[PDB]
Scaffold this active site. Structure first.
Site, PDB file in Angstrom:
ATOM      1  N   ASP A  83      -3.484  -6.513  -1.575  1.00 50.91           N
ATOM      2  CA  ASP A  83      -3.962  -5.808  -2.584  1.00 50.91           C
ATOM      3  C   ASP A  83      -3.566  -4.440  -2.876  1.00 50.91           C
ATOM      4  OD1 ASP A  83      -5.492  -8.057  -2.896  1.00 50.91           O
ATOM      5  OD2 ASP A  83      -6.812  -7.410  -1.195  1.00 50.91           O
ATOM      6  N   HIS A  88     -17.786  -7.332 -13.475  1.00 57.21           N
ATOM      7  CA  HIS A  88     -18.512  -6.499 -13.565  1.00 57.21           C
ATOM      8  C   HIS A  88     -19.927  -6.924 -14.298  1.00 57.21           C
ATOM      9  CE1 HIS A  88     -16.049  -3.513 -11.544  1.00 57.21           C
ATOM     10  NE2 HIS A  88     -15.059  -4.148 -12.583  1.00 57.21           N
TER      11      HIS A  88
END
Ligand SMILES: [Zn+2]
Ligand SMILES: [Zn+2]
Ligand SMILES: [Zn+2]
Length: 736
Positions: free
Chosen positions: A583, A678
């Site tokens: 990542d 989100h």
């Protein structure tokens, strides 16, 4: 003789009293009176520390209950249309910051290349007018504590306008604020102000080059309307652009960053273009936490002094960007702690540098250098690491040949489904181990991992993840087990609003010594016969989220970390983990301000990534997650990483984010984030998101997955979203 100053100070307080105070107010646990009294106690506390350090000009105005840009918005009447009906008070202030039940919050953006986020102004038909005397109140308040040492600070109009949104006409917007700034400054001078720090960091950036004449008009104006003010055209974060032009501004002083704009500013003064002006010299690192190199810095100050009419010594940016103090860090090695300096320590440094420039003798000065030298000479900064000449930078087989070998070993269905690695954490209450046996905590996390393993199995996700329930920070979880890293007890830094982070410190050479993530990952894999992924953080993110060494170049550090990731990846492969995901969510944030420096950064980034990932077997599948947006910028670099699969966020763009990979005919594997993690997606909503990128590149190239991690979301909505994800994918599969 030689003055010392500062640009700003943290709001937090030594133990985050500021955070607890404003958060308690939002929860209805603190009255207005106790809000303001508490905020007052803190300010007076901070003014005293700065006074006691010996500062001649103490910054007043940067203290805020949320954000210094937001403060200007409310103060200048730049209030979002949707809030135009509310009364102008602290509740409206926080309504803009956080949103109330009817109106959503204003957006926030990154404060330049720092870890701080400001609240973005939303311009409309609104006529700019002063809604309070915020800065005057603060100034008069400070005068009672520090007197004539009080130096009002404020973000200038040009930068404020450039950081805004909705501005139809730039110079008109800027122009409409001038009369407000005039009144603000004129009141301050009337109250006794002399030096006033006016921040225009926009003039250290590429964009800034469009505003050189606006700078001329704006500051000529201030100099005509407030002739008695000593203005400090204050810049930071990089060198002054067009220095030969800007050096002609009708201002009394210039604030130059000699820490992040050393070479450019250094050659800006060697010209003798500031010999008639006062330089506010940013010579102490305001964004990092190492004790200053006094020999280096003193010699620098001598050059500056001879190239200016007057010198004032300060840090390179507001201390907003560093922790408060090392005084209570009692777990640290003394050789390290004596080489560290947070906000309070830097106030002392700035004072001692000035007294030594003025030829005053102080035992502390050489003692500082002694403590500095010890740190450099420490064993931990002389560790013998793996010889990089014996380390592969390129995988044996290229992508195409690896794709086959891997397909023969994995036989994943067309458009495989999966997730970015992390699942919602409920329990945080369990972690307080507080005191609980390790064999209990482990057994606890492992039960939770199995649970989610079955979940993913039922949802029929063909590539699983353990959930990362054992991880609270994607960087510190690694920093905890890598040599050369250390955490702090109290090193908090405000990131936005009441949020703060406590970044690790890379104080010594970085070295992998023990398995960091192998246990959890190998367990999860033992439960299922479907591929489980390992999740790791790349060197870019690890560096950007930590306070990095400044005594060795970026690339050297990157490579050191790359090596550790390599050694951890080896362990994973050894243990049977067949897919490993690296990542890098900070690549954007770590990108240098100047376009002219981004390539060198990206090159360092790509090489270290190669160090991390080039020693795997051809059959082992390397994935990288990048929660970014403007890929067109770093496209070449991305293709350079040579990742088997790279996953992106295509939900926000409805899938149009592939444009860059389309143009660059990306021949590698691409994961499609088809759901904003989100914000519930509809099935017909996800399929459209999937098929969009199928326009140019072939289907045998894509993966279906969420935008990013799911630690944010709730388990209920998470499971429902995943069901839809798998269904949307399967569907597009049937239609071949
Ligand atoms: Zn952030
Ligand atoms: Zn000397
Ligand atoms: Zn290379």
């Amino acid at each position: 003789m030689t003055k010392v100053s500062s640009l700003g100070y943290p709001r937090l307080g030594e133990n985050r009293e500021w955070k607890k105070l404003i958060e308690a107010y939002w929860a209805g646990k603190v009255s207005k009176n106790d809000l303001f009294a508490g905020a007052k106690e803190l300010r007076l506390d901070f003014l005293k520390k700065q006074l006691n350090a010996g500062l001649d000009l103490i910054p007043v105005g940067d203290f805020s209950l949320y954000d210094h840009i937001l403060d200007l918005s409310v103060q200048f009447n730049i209030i979002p249309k949707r809030f135009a009906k509310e009364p102008i008070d602290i509740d409206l202030y926080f309504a803009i910051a956080r949103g109330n039940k009817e109106n959503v919050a204003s957006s926030m953006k990154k404060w330049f290349n720092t870890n701080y986020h400001y609240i973005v102004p939303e311009w409309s038909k609104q006529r700019p007018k002063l809604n309070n005397n915020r800065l005057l109140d603060l100034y008069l308040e400070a005068r009672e504590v520090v007197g004539d040492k009080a130096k009002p600070v404020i973000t200038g109009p040009i930068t404020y306008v450039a950081l805004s949104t909705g501005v139809e006409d730039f110079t008109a917007a800027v122009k409409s604020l001038l009369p407000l700034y005039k009144q603000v400054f004129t009141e301050l001078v009337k109250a006794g102000a002399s030096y006033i720090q006016v921040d225009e960091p926009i003039f250290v950036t590429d964009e800034g080059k469009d505003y050189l004449q606006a700078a001329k008009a704006v500051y000529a104006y201030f100099a005509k309307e407030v002739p008695d003010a000593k203005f400090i055209f204050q810049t930071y974060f990089e060198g002054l652009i067009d220095s030969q032009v800007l050096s002609q501004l009708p201002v009394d002083a210039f604030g130059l960053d000699f820490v992040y704009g050393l070479e450019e500013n250094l050659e800006a003064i060697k010209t003798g273009a500031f010999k008639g002006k006062e330089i506010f010299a940013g010579v102490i690192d305001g964004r990092n936490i190492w004790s200053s190199d006094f020999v280096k810095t003193s010699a620098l100050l001598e050059t500056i002094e001879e190239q200016s009419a007057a010198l004032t010594i300060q840090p390179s940016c507001s201390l907003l960007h560093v922790p408060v103090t090392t005084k209570n860090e009692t777990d640290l090695d003394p050789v390290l702690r004596n080489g560290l300096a947070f906000a309070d320590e830097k106030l002392t440094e700035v004072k001692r540098l000035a007294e030594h420039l003025d030829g005053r003798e102080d035992p502390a000065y050489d003692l500082h250098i002694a403590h500095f030298d010890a740190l450099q000479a420490a064993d931990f900064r002389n560790v013998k690491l793996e010889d990089l000449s014996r380390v592969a930078t390129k995988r044996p087989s290229d992508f195409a040949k690896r794709r086959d070998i891997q397909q023969e070993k994995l036989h994943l269905p067309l458009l495989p489904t999966t997730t970015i690695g992390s699942f919602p954490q409920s329990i945080r209450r369990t972690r307080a181990w507080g005191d609980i046996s390790d064999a209990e905590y482990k057994q606890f996390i492992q039960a939770e991992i199995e649970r989610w393993i079955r979940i993913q199995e039922d949802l029929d996700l063909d590539v699983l993840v353990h959930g990362e329930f054992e991880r609270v920070d994607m960087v510190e979880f690694f920093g905890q087990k890598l040599a050369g890293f250390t955490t702090t007890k109290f090193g908090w830094v405000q990131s936005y609003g009441s949020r703060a982070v406590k970044p690790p410190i890379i104080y010594g050479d970085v070295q992998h010594l023990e398995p960091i993530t192998v246990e959890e990952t190998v367990y999860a894999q033992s439960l299922t016969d479907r591929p489980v992924k390992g999740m790791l953080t790349g060197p870019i993110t690890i560096t950007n989220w930590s306070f990095e060494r400044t005594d060795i170049p970026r690339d050297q550090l990157f490579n050191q970390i790359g090596l550790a990731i390599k050694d951890e990846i080896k362990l994973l492969e050894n243990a049977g983990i067949a897919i490993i995901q690296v990542d890098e969510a900070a690549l954007r944030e770590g990108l240098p301000l100047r376009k002219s420096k981004q390539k060198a950064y990206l090159d360092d980034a790509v090489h270290a990534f190669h160090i991390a990932t080039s020693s795997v077997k051809d059959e082992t599948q390397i994935h990288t997650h990048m929660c970014y947006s403007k890929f067109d910028e770093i496209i070449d670099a991305i293709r350079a990483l040579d990742a088997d699969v790279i996953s992106i966020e295509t939900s926000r763009s409805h899938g149009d984010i592939i444009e860059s990979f389309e143009t660059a005919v990306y021949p590698l594997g691409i994961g499609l984030g088809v759901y904003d993690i989100h914000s519930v997606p509809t099935k017909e909503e996800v399929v459209a998101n999937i098929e969009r990128p199928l326009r140019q590149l072939s289907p045998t190239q894509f993966w279906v997955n969420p935008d990013c991690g799911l630690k944010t979301r709730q388990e209920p909505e998470t499971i429902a979203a995943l069901k839809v994800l798998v269904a949307a994918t399967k569907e597009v599969r049937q239609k071949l």
